[PDB]
């Protein structure tokens, strides 16, 4: 329910300050757009232990977590260590064309994404498809006429 400016005013600046003080920190940045989510990044001096950095960041977030808004708290905040660089892209094509993009996406999310994210070394699996769901496309002209 918040735009880029709104979410930037509400959460990003609040989280930034406490994160600023982590050990072996090199720089910290933040990104905000209309996608509706904030993306704070903390880069640490080369050679630092990734697990130690992640636990320190989580400690400093739970230290500041109390001061954050209720709406921010409800959805939760995800802390994860990744490389921001693709290693490979794994896809499911339909050369015979029986299945459209929706079916391929639902199969990939339900089956393949979970299996692949368990494999060793996989920092994160970024899916470019979405699960099937029942969509109700409402025509507003009929709503007023019917009184609903």
């Amino acid at each position: 329910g918040a735009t880029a400016k709104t979410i930037n005013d509400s959460v990003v600046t609040l989280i930034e300050r406490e994160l600023s003080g982590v050990k072996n920190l090199l720089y910290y940045s933040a990104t905000t757009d209309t996608s509706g989510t904030a993306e704070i990044t903390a880069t640490f001096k080369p050679g630092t232990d990734v697990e130690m950095a992640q636990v320190d960041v989580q400690n400093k977030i739970k230290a500041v977590e109390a001061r954050l808004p209720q709406v921010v708290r409800q959805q939760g905040l995800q802390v994860e260590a990744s490389s921001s660089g693709f290693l490979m892209l794994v896809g499911i094509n339909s050369p015979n064309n029986q299945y459209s993009e929706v079916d391929l996406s639902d199969y990939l999310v339900r089956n393949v994404v979970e299996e692949l994210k368990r494999v060793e070394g996989v920092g994160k699996v970024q899916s470019f498809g979405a699960e099937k769901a029942m969509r109700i496309w409402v025509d507003p002209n009929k709503l007023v006429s019917y009184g609903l």
């Binding site: 499911i92 299945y99 299996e115 996989v122």
Partner: protein, 49 residues
């Protein structure tokens, strides 16, 4: 982490999932950086010997 081992594990898991793949769907890996690794090392060894 190591790129080659992670890519090998991912491809092995994909191979495992090719057993239950429903007909009409085919796995593909258009982009992969792991294969480059070996070809690099093998040149250095060529310059080594």
């Amino acid at each position: 982490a190591n790129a080659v081992k992670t890519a090998e594990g991912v491809r092995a898991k994909i191979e495992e999932l090719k057993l239950n793949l429903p007909e009409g769907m085919e796995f593909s890996i258009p982009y992969d950086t792991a294969p480059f690794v070996k070809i690099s090392i093998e040149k250095v060894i060529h310059t080594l010997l």
